[PDB]
Design an enzyme around this catalytic site. Structure first.
Site, mmCIF file in Angstrom:
data_model
loop_
_atom_site.group_PDB
_atom_site.id
_atom_site.type_symbol
_atom_site.label_atom_id
_atom_site.label_comp_id
_atom_site.label_asym_id
_atom_site.label_seq_id
_atom_site.Cartn_x
_atom_site.Cartn_y
_atom_site.Cartn_z
ATOM 1 N N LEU A 1 -2.705 -0.026 -6.261
ATOM 2 C CA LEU A 1 -1.708 -0.945 -5.740
ATOM 3 C C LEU A 1 -1.702 -1.053 -4.223
ATOM 4 C CD1 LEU A 1 1.207 0.506 -7.866
ATOM 5 C CD2 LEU A 1 0.174 -1.700 -8.380
ATOM 6 N N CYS B 1 -5.837 3.915 5.670
ATOM 7 C CA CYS B 1 -6.686 5.009 6.135
ATOM 8 C C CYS B 1 -6.192 6.345 5.611
ATOM 9 C CB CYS B 1 -6.734 5.090 7.663
ATOM 10 S SG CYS B 1 -5.245 5.825 8.398
ATOM 11 N N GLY C 1 -5.164 7.034 2.610
ATOM 12 C CA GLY C 1 -5.479 7.209 1.207
ATOM 13 C C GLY C 1 -5.106 5.949 0.429
ATOM 14 N N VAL D 1 -2.549 4.282 -3.131
ATOM 15 C CA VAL D 1 -1.394 4.371 -4.021
ATOM 16 C C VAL D 1 -1.739 3.711 -5.351
ATOM 17 C CG1 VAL D 1 1.077 4.023 -4.291
ATOM 18 C CG2 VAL D 1 0.095 4.230 -2.011
ATOM 19 N N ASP E 1 11.858 4.892 10.616
ATOM 20 C CA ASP E 1 11.221 3.597 10.359
ATOM 21 C C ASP E 1 11.924 2.898 9.202
ATOM 22 O OD1 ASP E 1 7.792 2.377 9.755
ATOM 23 O OD2 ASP E 1 9.562 1.418 10.676
HETATM 24 F F1 LIG Z 1 4.809 9.885 -1.515
HETATM 25 C C1 LIG Z 1 6.155 10.052 -1.779
HETATM 26 C C2 LIG Z 1 6.745 11.298 -1.719
HETATM 27 C C3 LIG Z 1 8.079 11.428 -1.976
HETATM 28 C C4 LIG Z 1 8.867 10.255 -2.312
HETATM 29 C C5 LIG Z 1 8.274 9.014 -2.369
HETATM 30 C C6 LIG Z 1 6.938 8.898 -2.115
HETATM 31 C C7 LIG Z 1 6.194 7.502 -2.157
HETATM 32 N N1 LIG Z 1 6.122 6.903 -3.501
HETATM 33 C C8 LIG Z 1 5.647 5.504 -3.488
HETATM 34 N N2 LIG Z 1 4.945 5.077 -2.440
HETATM 35 C C9 LIG Z 1 4.516 3.811 -2.407
HETATM 36 S S1 LIG Z 1 3.579 3.212 -1.001
HETATM 37 C C10 LIG Z 1 2.922 1.566 -1.573
HETATM 38 N N3 LIG Z 1 3.066 0.588 -0.699
HETATM 39 C C11 LIG Z 1 1.891 -0.164 -0.754
HETATM 40 C C12 LIG Z 1 1.913 -1.491 -1.517
HETATM 41 O O1 LIG Z 1 3.121 -2.202 -1.501
HETATM 42 C C13 LIG Z 1 4.110 -1.622 -0.719
HETATM 43 C C14 LIG Z 1 4.222 -0.126 -0.988
HETATM 44 N N4 LIG Z 1 4.772 2.964 -3.405
HETATM 45 C C15 LIG Z 1 5.486 3.327 -4.505
HETATM 46 C C16 LIG Z 1 5.956 4.647 -4.576
HETATM 47 C C17 LIG Z 1 6.686 4.764 -5.809
HETATM 48 N N5 LIG Z 1 6.621 3.561 -6.452
HETATM 49 N N6 LIG Z 1 5.912 2.700 -5.672
HETATM 50 C C18 LIG Z 1 5.662 1.264 -6.084
HETATM 51 C C19 LIG Z 1 4.497 0.618 -5.363
HETATM 52 C C20 LIG Z 1 4.277 -0.765 -5.946
HETATM 53 C C21 LIG Z 1 3.563 -1.723 -5.233
HETATM 54 C C22 LIG Z 1 3.396 -2.998 -5.820
HETATM 55 C C23 LIG Z 1 3.932 -3.289 -7.090
HETATM 56 C C24 LIG Z 1 4.640 -2.320 -7.794
HETATM 57 C C25 LIG Z 1 4.813 -1.052 -7.217
#
Ligand SMILES: Fc1ccccc1CNc1nc(SCN2CCOCC2)nc2c1cnn2CCc1ccccc1
Length: 265
Positions: free
Chosen positions: A17, A21, A23, A25, A130
């Site tokens: 998703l 740089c 990593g 998700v 942020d």
């Molecule tokens: F590490 C940690 C450690 C502790 C608490 C929380 C985290 C981060 N936990 C996440 N981190 C991130 S980062 C992702 N970015 C990149 C892309 O779109 C913006 C977000 N996304 C996350 C989660 C938990 N659920 N989701 C959904 C991402 C998504 C994107 C598109 C459609 C559906 C779902």
């Protein structure tokens, strides 16, 4: 290793998703049963001691409006397993197909949830640094949550930053309140970039001279007043998140009892 540690074979990375740089998700499954978000860390980018310190923080913050850590693979390559936020970022949510149906009662309830998460951050004596719609995650039924701000800071926006933080490095819970004011404008504009038409250098120049964004179209003046409290020049005069949460929760009874729906808000 902790009770938080899990074996590497207990995770399936199904859909990528996001990518940077740092990593990647993924959406995946944990133990064959649990829908999860899986953040990977590229090997060699971060000191194991620094990850150990941030992991400790992650395992100590539990709040229903903070994205919940589930598990960790804490040896390189590192994996981070959290609850899955099925709609992605609040920024993308507001900009996308849902934005046009959201009215002020939905957007203010979203702001109340984010204030509640930041209120918890506030009473644990942490600082986000942020706060903005790109860093808030959205799940089913308009649930909004604050993400992993501590890990985010270690991995690493003038228009969301309070002046004393942008100029003098004075990052505090009161500079998060300023950012929360900017986030209120994101909600009420369905995700537009703040200070439209202005570049960073002019935003900084103007805000020092006392410029503040005006009332967005169809947004009630009482909600613009709350924004202006968040943008007070003295950080100690800005309201607490505890106050912001209670004001937003009570908004349509105590503040705008005569609200009538409009074309966009
Ligand atoms: F590490 C940690 C450690 C502790 C608490 C929380 C985290 C981060 N936990 C996440 N981190 C991130 S980062 C992702 N970015 C990149 C892309 O779109 C913006 C977000 N996304 C996350 C989660 C938990 N659920 N989701 C959904 C991402 C998504 C994107 C598109 C459609 C559906 C779902």
């Amino acid at each position: 290793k902790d009770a938080w540690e899990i074996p590497r074979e207990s995770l399936r990375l199904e859909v990528k998703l996001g990518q940077g740089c740092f990593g990647e998700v993924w959406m995946g499954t944990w133990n064959g049963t649990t829908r999860v978000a899986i953040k990977t860390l590229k090997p060699g980018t971060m000191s194991p001691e620094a990850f150990l310190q941030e992991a400790q923080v992650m395992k100590k913050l539990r709040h229903e409006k903070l994205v919940q850590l589930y598990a960790v693979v804490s040896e390189e390559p590192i994996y981070i397993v959290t609850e899955y936020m099925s709609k992605g970022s609040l920024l993308d949510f507001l900009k996308g197909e849902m934005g046009k149906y959201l009215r002020l009662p939905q957007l203010v309830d979203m702001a109340a949830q984010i204030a509640s998460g930041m209120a918890y951050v506030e009473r644990m004596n942490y600082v986000h640094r942020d706060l903005r719609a790109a860093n808030i995650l959205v799940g089913e039924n308009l649930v909004c949550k604050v993400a992993d701000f501590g890990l985010a800071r270690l991995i690493e926006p003038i228009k969301w930053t309070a002046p004393e933080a942008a100029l003098y490095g004075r990052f505090t819970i009161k500079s998060d309140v300023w950012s929360f004011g900017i986030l209120l404008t994101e909600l009420t504009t369905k995700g537009r970039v703040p200070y439209p038409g202005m570049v960073n250098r002019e935003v900084l120049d103007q805000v020092e001279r006392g410029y503040r964004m005006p009332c967005p179209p169809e947004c009630p003046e009482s909600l613009h007043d709350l924004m202006c409290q968040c943008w007070r020049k003295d950080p100690e005069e800005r309201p607490t998140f505890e106050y912001l949460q209670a004001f937003l929760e009570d908004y349509f009874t105590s503040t705008e009892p005569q609200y009538q729906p409009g074309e966009n808000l």
